[PDB]
């Protein structure tokens, strides 16, 4: 089949029921609106699990489900088998990744 990794992101709850959307390198992108970020009990966060078994990194996009969404700005963002963040940019940022969910 393949490697069969796994790719985890962690996104603040600014919402309460934001859709991710993510797309593996050489796949498919997934049933838009993305896909409802899981509830983080970290302490008020999302979190989404998603597989790329056959990809090297896979791409990750952020939207409310209402009408804003975010990607990389405007195009989608990128990242490698893991666990990444995704946080707000609260202030003048665009969406902030980071790699390794967060320790409280």
Same mark, same amino acid.
């Given at each position: 089949?393949?490697?069969? *990794?796994?790719?985890?992101? $962690? +996104?603040?709850? !600014?919402?309460?029921?934001? $859709?991710?959307? +993510?797309?593996? =390198?050489?796949?498919?992108?997934?049933?838009?609106?993305?896909?409802?970020?899981?509830?983080?009990?970290? &302490? !008020? +966060?999302?979190?989404?699990?998603?597989?790329?078994? &056959?990809?090297?990194?896979?791409?990750?996009?952020? %939207?409310?489900? *209402?009408?804003?969404?975010?990607?990389? *700005?405007?195009? *989608? $963002?990128?990242?490698? #088998?893991?666990? &990444?963040? +995704?946080?707000?940019?609260?202030?003048? %940022?665009?969406? #902030?990744?980071?790699?390794? =969910?967060?320790?409280?």
């Amino acid at each position: 089949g393949g490697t069969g *990794n796994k790719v985890t992101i $962690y +996104y603040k709850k !600014g919402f309460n029921s934001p $859709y991710i959307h +993510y797309r593996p =390198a050489g796949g498919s992108w997934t049933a838009a609106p993305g896909v409802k970020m899981q509830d983080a009990e970290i &302490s !008020g +966060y999302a979190k989404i699990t998603v597989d790329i078994g &056959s990809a090297s990194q896979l791409e990750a996009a952020f %939207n409310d489900g *209402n009408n804003n969404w975010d990607s990389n *700005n405007t195009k *989608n $963002y990128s990242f490698s #088998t893991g666990t &990444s963040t +995704y946080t707000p940019g609260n202030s003048g %940022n665009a969406g #902030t990744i980071t790699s390794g =969910a967060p320790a409280g």
